[PDB]
């Protein structure tokens, strides 16, 4: 739709602060900061597909809209996920140990963005079409 394509990490914000307030260790978070995956996001009838690529982590997440599946994050989270859609950005909620954390992401003129929150922390990453 207006996500279905092959985007590229082209800006980060603030995600050493988010892997941290995550949790992730250091050496993990070395190693996602200065990553540039792409994002490729696909759909078939009811299921989404999205995944992310880079050279030394991939993941691929499939779901349909409202139902809650069980992902195991890049850095190695065992979550509860739920992706809705609403006013066109697509929400995932990911559930863990009575923690939570979102992920927004939005189409917004030539961007795919991506907000993550975890607690007090905000990071924002763009993507453009590879
Ligand atoms: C392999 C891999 C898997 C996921 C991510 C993310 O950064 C995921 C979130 C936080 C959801 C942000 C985004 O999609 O850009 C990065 C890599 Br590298």
Same mark, same amino acid.
């Given at each position: 739709?207006?996500?279905?394509?092959?985007?590229?990490?082209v800006?980060?914000?603030?995600?050493?602060?988010?892997?941290?307030?995550?949790?992730?260790?250091?050496?993990?978070?070395?190693?996602?900061?200065?990553?540039?995956?792409?994002?490729?996001?696909?759909?078939?009838?009811?299921?989404?597909?999205?995944?992310?690529?880079?050279?030394?982590?991939?993941?691929?997440?499939?779901?349909?809209?409202?139902?809650?599946?069980?992902?195991? $994050?890049?850095?190695?989270?065992?979550?509860?996920?739920?992706? $809705?859609?609403?006013?066109?950005?697509?929400?995932?909620?990911?559930?863990?140990?009575?923690?939570?954390? $979102?992920?927004?992401?939005?189409?917004?003129?030539?961007?795919?963005?991506?907000?993550?929150?975890?607690?007090?922390?905000?990071? $924002?990453?763009?993507?453009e079409r590879?």
């Open positions: 739709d207006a996500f279905v394509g092959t985007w590229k990490l800006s980060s914000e603030n995600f050493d602060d988010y892997m941290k307030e995550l949790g992730v260790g250091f050496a993990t978070r070395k190693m996602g900061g200065m990553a540039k995956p792409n994002c490729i996001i696909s759909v078939n009838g009811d299921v989404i597909t999205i995944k992310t690529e880079s050279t030394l982590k991939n993941t691929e997440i499939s779901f349909i809209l409202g139902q809650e599946f069980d992902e195991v $994050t890049a850095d190695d989270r065992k979550v509860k996920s739920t992706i $809705t859609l609403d006013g066109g950005v697509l929400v995932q909620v990911q559930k863990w140990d009575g923690k939570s954390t $979102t992920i927004k992401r939005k189409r917004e003129d030539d961007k795919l963005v991506v907000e993550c929150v975890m607690k007090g922390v905000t990071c $924002t990453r763009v993507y590879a």
